[PDB]
Amino acid sequence: KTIKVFTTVDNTNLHTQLVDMSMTYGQQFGPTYLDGADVTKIKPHVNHEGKTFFVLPSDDTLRSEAFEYYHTLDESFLGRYMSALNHTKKWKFPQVGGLTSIKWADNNCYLSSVLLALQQLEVKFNAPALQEAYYRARAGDAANFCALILAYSNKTVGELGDVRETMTHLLQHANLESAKRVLNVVCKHCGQKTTTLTGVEAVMYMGTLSYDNLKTGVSIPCVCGRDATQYLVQQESSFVMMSAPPAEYKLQQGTFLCANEYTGNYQCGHYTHITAKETLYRIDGAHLTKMSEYKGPVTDVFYKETSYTTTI
Ligand SMILES: C[C@H](c1cccc2ccccc12)N1CCC(C(=O)NCc2ccc3c(c2)OCO3)CC1
Ligand SMILES: [Zn+2]
């Protein structure tokens, strides 16, 4: 005999569907899931009904629901999200220094840092999936948020990941609509040029870890065979993230918002988060340690911001 179940892609909109006892969900819906669990080819358990299944957007209304919720047109997204969620729901999200963190697992240290950094920045997401999952993550329930970050950045559970690259995909879905940056490049020979940067690039900079240094000038190669100076004339955003490859860099109190460091090599290494509180907290998944100063291989540093305009 048949039965009635519900299908969804966003978990908010449900669609009543007659489930023929004969087939496997896959024959009837396509790829299908339960709580992350893949069940594409299986038979409907006699007490299966009244349960909500995920499915691939196999028609207009579904495709439309996914885009609205996820803000993606990638036909594989929903299936990758589910694979990840399937595993992230096995992770532990303890409070460490008054933030949600991640107990080490499956090379997820980088996601930990992303997650700890986000919680300290006033940033909002456009995609309802991100908004909601983030709201739930700040509240200690971060399985969905991780699975989504993984899916947005095209990574799978187990792989080691780069915090910066990951920020790049995420900040693509953050409200940076008002975020503006103006940079001036002066070459003593070539002359001057000025650039306005919007979106992700208004907030993210690869070249120095120091925010002061971008204000005072950083040297860069000039097509002229010389060394140019790049400095910030104007900043409009609630934060900035500064990145460099791992080098020995000193973190003092009162100078930054938060940071992470990477120890190891490109192929194989470990991230830890540092946050500046009453004193410095170094958050390493579940583990916590304090110090008044840290000098190590910092890779990404965050600073708070409102509006900045240069003298000069
Ligand atoms: C911050 C740091 C870094 C950022 C920028 C410059 C750096 C330079 C040196 C060391 C770290 C640096 N780091 C680089 C890549 C790393 C990563 O995701 N690696 C994945 C991976 C997995 C298996 C591999 C492999 C790479 O290559 C071989 O097999 C994470 C972040
Ligand atoms: Zn030049």
Swiss-Prot record:
Residue limits of the Peptidase C16 domain?
69-312
Q: Which cofactor does it need?
A: Zn(2+)
Catalytic activity reads:
Thiol-dependent hydrolysis of ester, thioester, amide, peptide and isopeptide bonds formed by the C-terminal Gly of ubiquitin (a 76-residue protein attached to proteins as an intracellular targeting signal)
Q: Which residues form the Ubiquitin-like domain?
A: 1-55
Residues of the active site: 109, 270, 284
Where Zn(2+) 4 binds, per the record, is at 187, 190, 222, 224
The record's comment about this protein's domains reads: The hydrophobic region HD1 probably mediates the membrane association of the replication complex.
Listed name of the protein: Papain-like protease nsp3
Organism name: Severe acute respiratory syndrome coronavirus (SARS-CoV)
Whole-protein coverage range:
1543 to 1854 of 4382
